[PDB]
Point group: C3
């Protein structure tokens, strides 16, 4: 084949001359001096080259393992720190450790009804009321004419007038997995080593986990999943564009399916199967170039995505299985924690869980009626619902099962004596965090501390405290976001304009009808920070860059594949290295022990006094320790 194509161009890259010279010389040497067995193996010839159809052997070192199990340590449920696990020396080494919890089923206490035509308000910072049987708009402003008739949430179970019962739907919070573990701390002999919070694990969910292993993390921490959908076949006309003044006499309305000069219609003959939208008998072959006919009424199918899980409001939430993973330096690449130079005892884990108040919301189950106003003859019907969410009390369900599977690594009894008496160092990566508060809506500043080890990574964000304020209706739905989230409700209306009058062919201002079901929300997130600057002792280490440079490009290019991009453009990222966790060998670091001073400045358009903002910052401080 084309393998004899070389010369002055690819000579240096190929080295065919030196290769053949080496082969001939080694063949002569082996035939004359050595054993009478020419044509050596792929070891001597592969000394000044690189062959492809070959491999490199390496006697594998022995190792085994078995997934262990550890129970809690007599921990009260969710109220306090519901766990303090141990490290029982079952195996020999340590590795990843996963938590396990089963949240109890939640219910809803029986609620009352709006006894009279006007009941007192109060369920949030605001509330609603349905006044005087539709005669008024909202407690005043007498409208033209309207009426009220109470409905119920899950469909149309019409509730009797102002005296009945109605429960309240209960739904969990989005991403409830990494909300329970509000704080973690792993200490040996009392010396705390690493830790994080509910913010660091939120600043890693967007970055570390690649898009390949997505459904795993989406089903492991009790997050709702988007199940596929389908439908039946629905006919749709197909319309192409040919040319101007070529086949455009006029657009057809009810007849004359002709006057269409094609665009090489054999191209649209075997691709869309245009001869089979009709019930009449069709041959088992093609139908070529009919009179002004290229493609007619292809078959199209629609898709209706849906979901089902904890985020769907139901009268009874079944007990989910919210797995939680511990991300440390031991729960990383095994290329860790020998667990043999540590004596028996003084090895604990502290997990300060959260409360039940910020995990179980409610949903309105009343749906105060809509003012079916008849504005004279035109616009006869009209329905616009408004929730009537007088509160309930949820329940006191708590977790019952708690486990921590801690796999180990076994070692043969021969290797088990050389590393137990000696001491060995190793470079590990840990977490640091120092969150603060901010103000000064103008071009403010701040300062960073609690960072003393050499740093080769970073993270910046800006979480408004308004998102964590318990009085917000979307506190337990959009808390992990990183921006001022606004809702844009819509209305998938169902227009029905029918006129029974056989005469009066003018506009139908006599008989019309509108309707609706429920509002539809969309989480719209916006960025907050507009500029970023990192200075240290006068010299500006990183010039003023916009948001979309530290939020989109730096995560895009750096890290290769092991770093995705945040779906929200608010999360920042700063890197002082070339291999941000994609590799193990260090790729530089801006030291902090020698540079005490440090700064982070930024402009804003949302900080101030009414809507404050508490930024968060993490890091991966390279630091090496000694075992014994």
């Amino acid at each position: 084949c084309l393998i004899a194509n070389d010369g002055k161009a690819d000579k240096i890259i190929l080295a065919q001359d030196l290769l053949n010279s080496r082969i001939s010389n080694i063949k002569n040497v082996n035939k004359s001096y050595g054993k009478p067995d020419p044509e050596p193996t792929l070891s001597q010839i592969e000394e000044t080259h690189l062959v492809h159809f070959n491999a490199h052997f390496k006697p594998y070192v022995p190792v085994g393992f078995e997934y262990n199990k550890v129970r809690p340590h007599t921990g009260t449920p969710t109220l306090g720190n519901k766990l303090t696990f141990g490290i029982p020396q079952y195996g020999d080494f340590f590795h990843d450790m996963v938590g396990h919890h089963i949240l109890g089923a939640c219910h809803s206490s029986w609620q009352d009804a709006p006894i009279q035509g006007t009941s007192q308000m109060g369920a949030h910072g605001q509330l609603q009321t349905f006044p005087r049987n539709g005669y008024d708009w909202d407690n005043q402003t007498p409208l033209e004419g309207a009426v009220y008739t109470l409905v119920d949430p899950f469909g149309r179970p019409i509730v009797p007038g102002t005296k009945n019962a109605y429960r309240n739907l209960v739904y969990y919070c989005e991403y409830p997995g990494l909300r329970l573990y509000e704080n973690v701390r792993f200490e040996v002999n009392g010396n705390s080593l690493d830790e994080y919070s509910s913010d660091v694990t939120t600043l890693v969910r967007k970055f570390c986990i690649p898009g390949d292993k997505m459904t795993g993390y989406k089903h492991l921490v009790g997050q709702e999943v988007s199940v596929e959908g389908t439908s039946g076949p629905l006919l749709c006309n197909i319309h192409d564009l040919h040319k101007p003044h070529q086949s455009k006499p006029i657009l057809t309305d009810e007849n004359d399916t002709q006057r269409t000069c094609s665009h090489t219609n054999p191209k649209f003959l075997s691709q869309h199967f245009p001869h089979f939208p009709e019930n009449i008998q069709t041959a088992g072959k093609q139908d070529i170039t009919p009179i002004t006919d290229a493609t007619y009424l292809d078959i199209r199918r629609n898709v209706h995505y849906s979901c089902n899980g904890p985020q769907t409001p139901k009268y009874y939430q079944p007990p989910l299985a919210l797995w939680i993973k511990l991300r440390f330096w031991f729960n990383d690449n095994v290329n860790a924690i020998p667990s043999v130079s540590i004596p028996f005892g003084e090895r604990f884990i502290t997990i300060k869980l959260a409360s039940q108040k910020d995990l179980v919301n409610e949903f309105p189950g009343l749906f105060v009626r809509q003012s079916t106003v008849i504005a004279g003859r035109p616009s006869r019907r009209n329905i616009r619902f408004k929730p009537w969410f007088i509160p309930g009390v949820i329940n006191e369900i708590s977790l019952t099962n708690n486990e921590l599977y801690i796999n180990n690594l076994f070692v043969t009894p021969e290797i088990h004596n050389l590393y137990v008496k000696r001491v060995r160092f190793s470079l590990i990566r840990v977490h640091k965090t120092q969150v603060t508060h901010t103000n000064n809506n103008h071009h403010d500043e701040k300062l960073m501390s609690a960072l003393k080890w050499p740093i080769e990574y970073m993270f910046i964000g800006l979480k408004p405290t308004w998102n964590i304020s318990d009085q917000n209706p979307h506190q337990h739905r959009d808390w992990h976001k990183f921006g001022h989230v606004v809702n844009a409700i819509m209305q998938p209306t169902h227009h029905a304009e029918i006129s029974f009058q056989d005469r009066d062919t003018a506009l139908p201002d006599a008989c019309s009808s509108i309707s609706d079901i429920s509002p539809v929300t969309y989480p719209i997130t916006l960025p907050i920070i507009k500029n970023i600057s990192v200075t240290a002792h006068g010299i500006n280490l990183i010039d003023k860059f916009p948001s979309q440079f530290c939020s989109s490009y730096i995560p895009f290019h750096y890290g290769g594949n092991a770093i995705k991009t945040p779906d929200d453009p608010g999360a920042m990222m700063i890197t002082f290295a070339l291999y941000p966790r994609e590799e193990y060998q260090p790729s530089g670091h801006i030291n902090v022990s020698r540079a005490r001073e440090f700064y982070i400045s930024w402009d804003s358009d949302y900080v101030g006094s009414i809507t404050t903002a508490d930024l968060v910052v993490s890091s991966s401080a390279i630091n090496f320790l000694l075992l014994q």
Copy 2:
């Protein structure tokens, strides 16, 4: 003019940077090397990057390697004139054209399908029978289901639009559609063998339990188009206006609601931000060449939105005719892997065969409802006047058994120069390869049962579990050729997006119009839901419990997540499982741990459940990945 520049953060070290930098060692070495190469008469007193790379890893310097010349050319091997679709329709030979082998691809063309002309149910009462169940539209408006006193209804039969049919006197055709993912269903058995020595072999279960655990989240559409599966295209919508609704603060503004007018005076959220980022100036009135700063508390007013609609097309939609598909198939071996494989320098002429046992027709193609038995157009008095509810009505019977047309076996090679082709023609060498195992088994004992594993003799370093209920494979089920590759009890969740047309021509009596209404429908809509079956896994060998009992979601979603090495996706359907006795699960070529089943001839798999029984059993499939090597000659 040889001073320092901006003096960036590079002269910053200390107590924790010495070990990582070793600037003292670097300076000592570079100075000694400079003195050495200047003491021996060199015109370049500075050493290149060769002398400093002894114990340092520099980034701005590559490393060359003379690339040994190789090439390839996609050959083409027609079949062995085997039988059509019914029997094993292929046993491909091997031409000694090149010198090596690599990944191989199948190819197949499926003929066109049609429908057999039927007759309309001329009489208002017909005999049933098209599946395990059937129905009839009775008496043209007298009965609900073949007998019931019903007040009012009309049953006029009427697929692809509104094809109205004269009263019970016409014909019709049956819509035809293929099965989802036919590429993993056609090839039912593959067995590579030389000189009659069968080496590799698997079944139609490895082709399913690798599709979810080999391809990453990037080649999704690539595979979907390779195996001729339906694809999802994007769409747009007409520009429509949508309202906006922001929450400002508590008690900062107490405007409850106004029906028609007076929408203003609401607590603000630092307006300048919400104005610029939204540009609230949807209006026809004059819009100047700049942005307007908050006319009246205009934080967010009338944001613009556009919807998105998905759509589909291909072999997975019911049509009266199907163009010839092209179902490319791969051959998952150890040769269709990293480029070594199949030296083919000591293999004689011939004596290299493949075998591909195809499937039949009755397990791929089905029919589809075309009649759409008339809806119960009931008139329930004044309230809920109109009401529509369609229903299918089959009339099966068709063959159209067009089989696999021209089908090749595109296969590459690795040509070598005639010089190298003599140094490895006489030598013999081994290489650790991977060969798949499979031992299916039927099961019973609904309670916490167990089993015994067999058909496993090689040292094993990988594992698969699964549980596919036989109801999915039972051809008498009306949902077999749509959700057959699932690994859990599938259930359909029909719904109906009705039309609420509540018109009231009554000019007075503004109260509840309980006299006129309208309900409608179009067609059914399904939702395949997957629910796992296995609740625990406990693999044991020689009595000692090697792996304790673990929930399904630990062996389904987590164990491919923490492991895998960015090369193992996670299954959508949680029914699949996975166990690993190594550290590099197929991501690396070097083995990373394996337990031996040759010396330990005992092996057990125990699992509790609540779905097995007698009315619907379940057959579990188990794959593997052996680690065994071969020799040349």
Copy 3:
């Protein structure tokens, strides 16, 4: 654990005997040498093994950097080549370089109204007007009866009859990021080195970037992102299939919600929570052992996707930020472009920006009302809209601000002095390209030129010039496609079927209503080429293969995990190296300088003289370059 299961088959792969022999020999050596460490360390054992619970170190050389900034070179606005940047001598090396451009907001030219039911035609390749106030269909045919009014797109703000004003919506082009830079060029001291065009940037977006960073790319190059949506809860009637005739209810309208067969109820009643579809009391347990039925009214929540961004049609587009990356051999893996031995200055870029007439379209701003006919009582009303407009969006928005963020690589002044007097060659990659025109609808061929350097890469795509044709109404929205696209319109109507007659229970042919809002499109692509053939001087390199081979298998299997697959089946790809741009080492190449002749043939079904086609070809050549 079970790790002592040795034998005779795993000898070659474990070498436990040789491991024990080596460790015993080194132990006896250490004991006879008189050392206080009788056990050997991890140093002498790794000669013929590979430990897994251990890592390797590498003393790293220090290196810093800082993202600099360069301004334009007083070039023209978007009309001409709006930039020719330079290089500042602030750093010591080169690396990835991102541009930055913003586009000022636009406006709309106020137009008049169609004063009468007949006016002048001509507003695009095709045009039309609203006819005869409803008497006719195109002012040339009697019709039953209708009436024509006007409406604005954003809703239905009924326009006064044939007397008002209106604007025209302004919407940007799809993927404006890879459309500005029509031609790039990099040259040092006049000598040109590499270049590309918009075709190469559109043939590298579908292949190079993995599927993970798609979210980042969509925000980088300014494309609307499909933000997730939610909806309200609604019940669905679940209905499973048990067995053939095991229990045979035919059908029922409203009753008989039982009597189906069993499917091991404890399993099918514990995963759907049958205790929360009803208002009646729900105990603190399940509802096990009910009358035989699989499930009872599961809860479902739909998901509505929604899009927003510069691609949506509005009246005023805020200033976007079209970030653009530059793909070279310098903006790639730095494991480049020293520019230390290069003199100061004398190195520029060139960016021939595109035009403004092909980046902004218009949208119809006055929809002619539909044929509101009255065809008797049944199917009386009917609405189907049609567009109507008048261009004039020639407004002069242009790119005001421009920068070029170039990072560097600072070196310690100790390494900076060893290679400042030396020259080094290194294998690099460029982007050759040669576009051409074609004809001969039948099984034609062509010739390839401007390719002489050794090639280890390829791309082929047949793009019909009907798309980029100026008069195409969909040109600046669907231009990045590689196939003849056809629009498949639909109509999600809303029906109304009411019988006003309280008696006469016959079919509701007394009142029937139709409606519509706006058409909906779904761009579908189709491949043109059916076979490929690459020959050179008689021999055949690649046999005739279907389009689905060089487009969906070769990129699939090759490239590893760094090459996505094209969603559009039009683009193809040929490889001549075993590693298609996955690694850095060369892995195959056919020199095309020794063999000057070259041919690329292909069948077709769309070429001709009505809609011609032009094939695009890129590559990645290899040719090392020297500094001094």
